[PDB]
Amino acid sequence: GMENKKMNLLLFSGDYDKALASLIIANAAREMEIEVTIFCAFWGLLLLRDPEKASQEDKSLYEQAFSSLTPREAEELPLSKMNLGGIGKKMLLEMMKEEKAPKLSDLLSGARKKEVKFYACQLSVEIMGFKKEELFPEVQIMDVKEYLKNALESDLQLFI
Amino acid sequence: NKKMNLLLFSGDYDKALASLIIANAAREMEIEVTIFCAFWGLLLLRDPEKASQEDKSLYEQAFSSLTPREAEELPLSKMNLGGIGKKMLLEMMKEEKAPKLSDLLSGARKKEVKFYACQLSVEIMGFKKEELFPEVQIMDVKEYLKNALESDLQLFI
Amino acid sequence: NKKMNLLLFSGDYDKALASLIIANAAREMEIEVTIFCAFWGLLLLRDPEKASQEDKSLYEQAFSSLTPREAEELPLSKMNLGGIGKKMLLEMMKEEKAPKLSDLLSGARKKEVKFYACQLSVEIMGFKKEELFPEVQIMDVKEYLKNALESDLQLFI
Numbered sequence: 001g002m003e004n005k006k007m008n009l010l011l012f013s014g015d016y017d018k019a020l021a022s023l024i025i026a027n028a029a030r031e032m033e034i035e036v037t038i039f040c041a042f043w044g045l046l047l048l049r050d051p052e053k054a055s056q057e058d059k060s061l062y063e064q065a066f067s068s069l070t071p072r073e074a075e076e077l078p079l080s081k082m083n084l085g086g087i088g089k090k091m092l093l094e095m096m097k098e099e100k101a102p103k104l105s106d107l108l109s110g111a112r113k114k115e116v117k118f119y120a121c122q123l124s125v126e127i128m129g130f131k132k133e134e135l136f137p138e139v140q141i142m143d144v145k146e147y148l149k150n151a152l153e154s155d156l157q158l159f160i
Numbered sequence: 161n162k163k164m165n166l167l168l169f170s171g172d173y174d175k176a177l178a179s180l181i182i183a184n185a186a187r188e189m190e191i192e193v194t195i196f197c198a199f200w201g202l203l204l205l206r207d208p209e210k211a212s213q214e215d216k217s218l219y220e221q222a223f224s225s226l227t228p229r230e231a232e233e234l235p236l237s238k239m240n241l242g243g244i245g246k247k248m249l250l251e252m253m254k255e256e257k258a259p260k261l262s263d264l265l266s267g268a269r270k271k272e273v274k275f276y277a278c279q280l281s282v283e284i285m286g287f288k289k290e291e292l293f294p295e296v297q298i299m300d301v302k303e304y305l306k307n308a309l310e311s312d313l314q315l316f317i
Numbered sequence: 318n319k320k321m322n323l324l325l326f327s328g329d330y331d332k333a334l335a336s337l338i339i340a341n342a343a344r345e346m347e348i349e350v351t352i353f354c355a356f357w358g359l360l361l362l363r364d365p366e367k368a369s370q371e372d373k374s375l376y377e378q379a380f381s382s383l384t385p386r387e388a389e390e391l392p393l394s395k396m397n398l399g400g401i402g403k404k405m406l407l408e409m410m411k412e413e414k415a416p417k418l419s420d421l422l423s424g425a426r427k428k429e430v431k432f433y434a435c436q437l438s439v440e441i442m443g444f445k446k447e448e449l450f451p452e453v454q455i456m457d458v459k460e461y462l463k464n465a466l467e468s469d470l471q472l473f474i
């Protein structure tokens with residue numbers, strides 16, 4: 001069986017639909033008792049923002065602009081295609097509602113509760129200017145060598 | 161005895177081309193190939209001569225009617241230009257005698273690449289099994305994971 | 318002991334950057350790294366001190382002249398806006414003294430990352446070996462599969 005397996009996802013994309021796929025896979029994995037690590041890098045870091053604990057305190061101006069102007073939480077992420085001003089996302093969301101397919105923010109709550117391990121790429125965090133306190137509290141800041149050690153120890157590795 | 165699993169998430173012509181170039185070559189080396197199509201990737205599996213509108217919601221009918229109807233109609237991931245920079249790629253491929261996507265797909269089907277459609281995507285998007293190629297099987301995410309964990313090479317495209 | 322294979326399909330500045338951050342770090346940990354560049358990913362390998370238009374078709378000549386001529390010219394995957402939001406990412410990296418894509422590429426070359434160019438893509442897009450960095454080897458998809466199957470980490474970017 002799959003109960004001792006390990007999966008590692010590098011979530012690079014900050015697209016709603018790619019994030020959804022990554023959490024559909026991670027939640028299903030956790031239900032099969034697979035240990036799941038999601039390493040968020042670049043745009044994927046946007047998945048990890050906690051809107052209730054955002055800040056502008058002691059960031060450069062570029063960092064402030066980036067933080068205020070980008071999606072402030074997972075649910076605000078744009079579609080990878082057909083976003084159409086936010087209308088084609090509105091489409092996908094409606095079709096999901098018809099099937100009772102849970103929204104990204106509910107899949108993310110689910111993944112946190114099932115103890116999917118979420119890591120934020122240190123260099124991406126530094127470049128984009130996010131503080132630890134701006135992300136969910138159980139997120140750990142991980143450098144790329146820690147990503148590689150984890151990925152090499154894993155049974156399934158994907159870049160999303 | 162090797163095995164490869166590709167998760168085709170993208171519905172882009174060029175990414176689909178890459179996936180089938182790799183899948184066809186792997187079958188020639190006697191590697192067993194599984195392609196799990198999810199979200200936009202499902203569009204690869206549409207049989208245009210079998211399309212249907214019966215028992216679909218409004219958005220499902222609209223999504224069906226207004227997305228690529230078959231693999232050859234997929235857009236480029238880049239410089240598609242409303243079909244024109246896809247038209248560039250196709251001309252460049254013609255000069256080099258590189259087969260089109262639909263010909264790679266026919267080859268994949270003949271070589272018995274195993275094509276699967278992600279159940280949740282199929283349901284969300286409203287596609288029926290009869291609208292897809294006959295040998296496609298519906299598989300859920302847990303079945304994908306089992307198959308991927310048993311594979312020797314796993315990619316997300 | 319360990320081996321990593323990256324298939325770089327994307328020709329985006331930020332995706333190439335991710336790939337070379339990973340590749341450079343892997344080399345420091347003594348992991349063997351193979352990067353197979355295909356389709357848009359081939360643009361990473363263009364040597365701007367070498368370019369040629371000689372013995373190419375019209376679309377090949379046009380493609381060569383109009384596309385990014387070296388890694389540093391690659392567009393952002395998103396929010397490129399004229400190259401100005403790339404300008405934004407670049408200025409943010411500069412504040413952090415994060416190395417540029419060209420510096421990571423030079424580092425990768427120095428650390429003996431193995432760079433291969435997909436033969437079919439090369440032929441379609443019309444690039445010649447002489448237009449790419451001298452250590453690049455042209456490899457077909459079956460060589461890609463052999464190498465990926467012997468690797469411990471395999472990603473498609």
Ligand SMILES: [Cl-]
Pocket residue numbers: 157158159160314315316317471472473474
């Ligand atoms: Cl991957």
Ligand code: NA
Pocket residue numbers: 063126127128129409412413
């Ligand atoms: Na910064």
Ligand code: NA
Pocket residue numbers: 158159160315316317472473474
């Ligand atoms: Na991937």
Ligand code: NA
Pocket residue numbers: 095098099220283284285286
């Ligand atoms: Na539906």
Ligand code: NA
Pocket residue numbers: 156157158313314315316470471472473
């Ligand atoms: Na993989």
Ligand code: NA
Pocket residue numbers: 252255256377440441442443
């Ligand atoms: Na050509």
